[PDB]
Subunit: 316 residues, 4 copies
Amino acid sequence: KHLEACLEGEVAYQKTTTGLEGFRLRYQALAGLALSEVDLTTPFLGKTLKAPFLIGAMTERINLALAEAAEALGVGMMLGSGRILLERPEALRRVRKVAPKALLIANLGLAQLRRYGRDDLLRLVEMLEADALAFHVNPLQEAVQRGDTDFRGLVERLAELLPLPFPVMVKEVGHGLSREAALALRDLPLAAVDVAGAGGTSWARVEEWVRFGEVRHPELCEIGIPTARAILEVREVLPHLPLVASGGVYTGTDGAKALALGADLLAVARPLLRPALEGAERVAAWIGDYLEELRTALFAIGARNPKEARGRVERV
Amino acid sequence: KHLEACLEGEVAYQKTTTGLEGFRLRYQALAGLALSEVDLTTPFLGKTLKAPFLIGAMTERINLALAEAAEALGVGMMLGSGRILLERPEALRSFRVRKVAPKALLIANLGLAQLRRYGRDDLLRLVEMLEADALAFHVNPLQEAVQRGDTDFRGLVERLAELLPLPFPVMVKEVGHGLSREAALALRDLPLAAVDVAGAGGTSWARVEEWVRFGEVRHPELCEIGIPTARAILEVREVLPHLPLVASGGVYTGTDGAKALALGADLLAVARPLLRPALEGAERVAAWIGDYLEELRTALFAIGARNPKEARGRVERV
Amino acid sequence: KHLEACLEGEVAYQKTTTGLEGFRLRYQALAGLALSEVDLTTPFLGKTLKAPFLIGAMTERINLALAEAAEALGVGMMLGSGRILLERPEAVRKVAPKALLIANLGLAQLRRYGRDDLLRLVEMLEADALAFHVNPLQEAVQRGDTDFRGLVERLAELLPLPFPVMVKEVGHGLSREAALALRDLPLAAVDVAGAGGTSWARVEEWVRFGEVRHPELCEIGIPTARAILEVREVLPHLPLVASGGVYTGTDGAKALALGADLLAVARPLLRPALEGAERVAAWIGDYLEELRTALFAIGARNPKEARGRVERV
Amino acid sequence: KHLEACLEGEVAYQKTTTGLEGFRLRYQALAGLALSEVDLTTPFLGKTLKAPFLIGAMTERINLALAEAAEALGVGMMLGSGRILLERPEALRSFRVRKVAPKALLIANLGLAQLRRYGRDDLLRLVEMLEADALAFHVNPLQEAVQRGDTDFRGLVERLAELLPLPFPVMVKEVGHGLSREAALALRDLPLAAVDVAGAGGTSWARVEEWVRFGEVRHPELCEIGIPTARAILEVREVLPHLPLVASGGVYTGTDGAKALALGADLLAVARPLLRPALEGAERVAAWIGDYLEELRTALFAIGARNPKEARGRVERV
Ligand SMILES: Cc1cc2nc3c(=O)[nH]c(=O)nc-3n(C[C@H](O)[C@H](O)[C@H](O)COP(=O)(O)O)c2cc1C
Ligand SMILES: Cc1cc2nc3c(=O)[nH]c(=O)nc-3n(C[C@H](O)[C@H](O)[C@H](O)COP(=O)(O)O)c2cc1C
Ligand SMILES: Cc1cc2nc3c(=O)[nH]c(=O)nc-3n(C[C@H](O)[C@H](O)[C@H](O)COP(=O)(O)O)c2cc1C
Ligand SMILES: Cc1cc2nc3c(=O)[nH]c(=O)nc-3n(C[C@H](O)[C@H](O)[C@H](O)COP(=O)(O)O)c2cc1C
């Protein structure tokens, strides 16, 4: 569906980048620490993850694979647009069968707050038996896919539905959250921001690859906040909220770089998707590769753990 | 034979860019607005437009194609130069245009330098001949000198200044070698309605010119001389904090539109890219303008700007 | 192996670069001096060389060729790791009587080694100094012993030794903070061995996979030019070797220009080592005359005199 | 000779550049001046050139081409190294060049190294043997090294220092690896008439030297040591505010000519590229040259400058 674009099309950004190639890892030959004691263990949205990683949201055989990998690996998982479920409740025909203990994030999209209402959300979130809810905010994509294009007053509605019984994050989808995105999110009691930055998959470009099987407006589709900038920007404003770096953060090294710009967890999506198509055990491989690298990067930089990486980079 | 060249010759600047690509549109995911409510409507030169846009000067089936789209669309049109017009008034049967474009925005074209030859009266005769809403003198030394033109530009600002405020409103433009902060300085009193900065990055009139005079570009470098558009807008805006600014010079996509507006332009203007379109005629033109205009709207919306004045500021250095 | 990785595989850094190419030999046309008068002679680690230069650690037909060239041209040599030698004690100073042989251990071996073995290693081999190489990133990638806990402090006590000792990376470079860690220790030198040349992490991947599976990880490093710079703000006077793809004399000279007392090349010295001793010197002598000329062209009478003579391109 | 190195080698810098691509000409649409009044006339080393050009020092039938072109065109010219002449007593006669070029400004050159073995009195001799107008000593350590030629620049500048104010004017020039700021400081006291900063970015004498020895460049990187031209003009100017500077070395196009001019040069010089016209001879060298000046003029006209000196500062860092 979109599935065909992510899999088949040149949907990756063609000119913007995460910006992380702009930073270089401060390498610490004499840090006198031991691979050994670089500890990926990171708590998130109230479950203790085994490394600071979320399989990032994608859109029913695919999820099952990720879901098992998530379990096997003590990573976390966001869970496509539950958009359908909010008036098709037995399209829950759903992932906790293969993933009891894993951290599930249900994900929704701020816009849906305009049809649905608190209950609908408590009901979604338990429908999926998730641990938290991601609202995805996504104007460009939406604009581009000639889709529901009204983000007007979304934040107030979020604002007032607030401190919901489960954790809530706002994320973007890869055209990224700005400084001012964040000033808006500023005291909504959210549990997490996913900055979902520019650099990897462009939803814009995706959307158009569906409309025209090619990208008519290469350039619009590059609109966005390159992940590194977004981390930097968002953190500067929310010192305390846990930041998810996602958006073209496709290698664990890049991951560390991300961590070092002050982020907290990493998330991947499009790259995870093909593996997703040959089952967990494979996905599982991909992810644990990323963390094996990550660990190593963190070790190279003298960080004993993902939080200890803030600062450990300089402008290439 | 510039027409044959704009179409056949690689007359776009080869090494200079509008430098619009130095600039990141400051995308706002929680800008909190309805795309539905982003409003391109711009009042320009005493009329009112659907977009902040003008098709820009060319030089006359093409002319008709363009003026159609301009009427169809709620956008503006710089007529190509009526030098010939002034010269051969009978020949006056091209800018019929007004016929395919009754209420549209026609801007009359001339070239600051013709003012060595024409006067208040010749100007109005041009404006009426043409029946069009304003007059834009394009200044262009480097295009000139290359043309092996005439290429005396002394006193032109003041010759113009003194035949100031006319009947119709009046704008100064370049041909996309662009206007520097000092051009703008020179224009600081001249009661102009607009200034279009027409910077480098797009079609290099010098490069054109030579591709005519040789069918190749002999002095490549000479022909990248210019103030790149993003820079010119920037520049011309500090001098002229308010007077409307057109921004043209390979501002060939809606998104660069936005960047350009972001950096301080009030309107944008495409020319050469319209040319080929104005072969397959009027229809195809608007598909091109229309598309741009939509691209601009989304961008503007992605940037979190309700309408075009609202992007002043929404951009930053790559 | 590691060997034919360095030979067959593109193990050179693919993205990170030494940074030397971002520095301009401050040239000086009216420097006013004589090329004959430019003097490569440098005293290093209690001996004296005809050049500020070392052949670098490699991994006993090649060692022979190299060490030969070290005796002919009158330059340093760093022996490949004598880990094995410690291990299987019954297993080359005779090809190079009075040359500067620097013995190579590996900072992490102090995990199982102590002074005596250090001493024994220096002796069996016949050597003026001990250079301990540190390299976690290389290690971690070659899934290894990779406990680097307490290394410096261990060295620091086990130090003030009966010879010159030097610390040394392997091509991922030493940072301002590494130097810091080594600040207090009575070291004779540090060779900063920076990124931009051979990536020891690209080597170990090419060994595990014949490809570099994790490109990015393996570019992690401190580029040579900067390591010189950083190491040097910290260690204002200690001798410094600048190695890590300082593969031409002109770079030699910038390296020396940024803060280096001397230079050291390796991977590119290895193909010449295959064919043998002659060629090794044909290559170094050549480098050495490139360096003298450049040293000359920036108006530096001798290598001490190039500190200064460079700028951000 | 060396000849088809400069004819057939890749002897052009491969990586360092002139620097002039760093600079952007601040194009002035409304400078309001007239091609017409941009005047190349620039006096130099005593005689008045018709433009700020010197045909660069090169190396005997080639010399007659340039020399003539020189006259026709009003430009200066370095004769190549009086080398042989002053101790292979030889010719008036040969290379020449004054029979085919009477009025033209002829700079004769020599190379600070011969000061080692030529006496003040050998120099006056050379100069009139040649019937030249001034003397340029080229200083050229790096070339010299690469070439395994005479390598001893020890105390050449006091040698120049003591035998100074000579009857003809006298410039120090390098050859394309450029003079530094500190080069300049050494020249600061000598009563020179000019410097030719001769910078990196055009023809690399090391790569030349090397292409002789080896038919290829064995040490690319050496051969690139050098002060790029633009940096040399900035740097040398900063220290001899008053001396006429020749920007040469890579300044292969009037546009870059202007760029140099505006980085604070006064004169401009070309060699390597002049060399092959020098082979099809004097009339199409003229072509070359006059074209470069026809471009100089245009860019100067773009820039708002009425003459070469007025270009100073009329550039910005792109
Ligand atoms: C098939 C597929 C489906 C996706 N569906 C969603 C979605 O429903 N909501 C969302 O926010 N992001 C979706 N994404 C993208 C990621 O969640 C995320 O926005 C990311 O930042 C883009 O990919 P990358 O970060 O791994 O480069 C999808 C991606 C793919 C490949
Ligand atoms: C065929 C053609 C004819 C043109 N004629 C004129 C003209 O008569 N007067 C003028 O001021 N500009 C003329 N222009 C150029 C535009 O107004 C403007 O300089 C522009 O920035 C060049 O193309 P761009 O805007 O898409 O790069 C012409 C352009 C073309 C392509
Ligand atoms: C074949 C080979 C073998 C090596 N063996 C060792 C070794 O045993 N111990 C060590 O510390 N370094 C060893 N090195 C590291 C070099 O000293 C190192 O690559 C240098 O500081 C920078 O690399 P460059 O030669 O690319 O300048 C070896 C290198 C090569 C190429
Ligand atoms: C064929 C040729 C011969 C040359 N001969 C001399 C020479 O005898 N003496 C000298 O000082 N420079 C000589 N030059 C160099 C130029 O005079 C000058 O310094 C210049 O900067 C190098 O070429 P370019 O500037 O035109 O790139 C020669 C150049 C060429 C191309």
